[PDB]
Amino acid sequence: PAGMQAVKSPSEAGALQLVELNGQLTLAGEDGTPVQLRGMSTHGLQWFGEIVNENAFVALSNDWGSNMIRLAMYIGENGYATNPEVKDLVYEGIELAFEHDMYVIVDWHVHAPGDPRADVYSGAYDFFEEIADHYKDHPKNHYIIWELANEPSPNNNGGPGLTNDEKGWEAVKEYAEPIVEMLREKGDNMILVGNPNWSQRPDLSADNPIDAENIMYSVHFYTGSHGASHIGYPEGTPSSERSNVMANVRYALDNGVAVFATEWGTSQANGDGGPYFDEADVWLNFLNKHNISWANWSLTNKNEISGAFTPFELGRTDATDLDPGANQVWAPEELSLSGEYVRARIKGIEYTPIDRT
């Protein structure tokens, strides 16, 4: 569609880098021109790993027009720590993304607990070392983007949580710096680093950034809970006052770091409520105007509003199969309100939703 110039495929854009455009750092391809990635995040690979299949990745790359996909590998909550097999899906997902021309975000999905240094996350360094080692030599190694800790937060389910302040950011930085260094020894691939309060604090990262190349900081928002803002923080505003997620993004960009919206939803923070579409238009027009890449949560048929596919509803609707079949397209009524909207926004087409009767 028109205005989609920057949403380039990896075959075209090549290795990603950060360039200074108008005093701010932005994602760019090999030739230095800005590139924006738009795509979907899987739900937990231990719960909805069925989405990693040929027809689904063809549909998402071609029919939905995604130039990226995010693979959410939970470690706690019956993920990788207790069920190592889920890593097989990370490999398969990378293979399909390579084949179907999408950048792929390998996400160590820190979530419960919220401190990435917690014991259950002990395999983080070895996990990234292993995946990086396998792909170092691959001609398509530059398609991989590493996301080291999804949502640092106060969540204390299964270990310690983190505070929403400098101490919480310093904890993430302490976790991240050895892994960043090892990953830099293996390549130049972009690393996306989460930050406090469920990655709502890229501003704390801007105040104290990781000294390394090609590091971007996450922002996560749900349009039912995180209200848009047009007034940025006054110069000199201390971190204690910075609670509006949109204004925190503007702060990060104005203060020298690059941001990547690695996860957002059309519901309230939980994954339910709404959807909140007029809000989603304001947030995505903000992201798009400022060349911030985004991954929407999520590729699931679970009955929750953020889920992209129609759920089982006893009365009348069976859950959409996460494999779309040979035609490699999911029919309109097989996408939920949220999935239908997000597909239109990834594609950059007009939002013309079907009558759901």
Determine the Cα–Cα distance for residues 258 and 274; give it in Å rounded to an integer. 30
Determine the Cα–Cα distance for residues 84 and 76; give it in Å rounded to an integer. 11
Q: What number of other Cβ atoms are within 10 A of residue 174's Cβ?
A: 11
Crossing angle of the two packed helices 337-347 and 277-289, in degrees rounded to 10: 20
Query: What Cα–Cα distance (Å) separates residue 20 from each residue in 17, 178, 259?
Result: 10, 26, 13
Experimental technique of record: X-ray
Q: Which class for 119: exposed (0-12), middle (13-18), buried (19 or more C-beta within 10 A)?
A: exposed
Provide CB contacts within 8 A for 27, sequence distance 6+. 16, 17, 18, 34, 35, 36, 37, 190, 216, 258, 260, 291, 293
Question: Which positions are annotated as active-site residues?
Answer: 151, 263
User: Pick from 342, 120, 312: which is nearest to 222 by CA?
Assistant: 342
8 A C-beta contact, residue 204 and residue 196 = yes
8 A C-beta contact, residue 301 and residue 324 = no
Determine the Cα–Cα distance for residues 27 and 48; give it in Å rounded to an integer. 30
φ/ψ bin of 2: left (φ > 0), alpha (ψ from -120 to 50), beta (otherwise): beta
Determine the Cα–Cα distance for residues 234 and 245; give it in Å rounded to an integer. 15
List the domains of the chain with CATH numbers.
1-357 (3.20.20.80)
Determine the Cα–Cα distance for residues 279 and 182; give it in Å rounded to an integer. 40
Residues in the chain: 357
DSSP 33-99: -B---EEEEES-HHHHGGG-SHHHHHIIIIIS--SEEEEEEESSTTSTTT-TTHHHHHHHHHHHHHH
**Half-sphere CA count of 292, side-chain side, radius 13 A:** 29
Going through 185-274 in order, the beta strands assigned E by DSSP cover: 191-193, 215-222, 259-265
∠ CA 227-230-307, nearest 5°, is 35
DSSP 88-131: HHHHHHHHHHHHTT-EEEEEEE--SSS-TTSGGGTTHHHHHHHH
In which residue are the tokens 């798009």 written? Answer: 288
Q: 213 in helix, strand or coil? A: coil
In which residue are the tokens 């028109």 written? Answer: 2
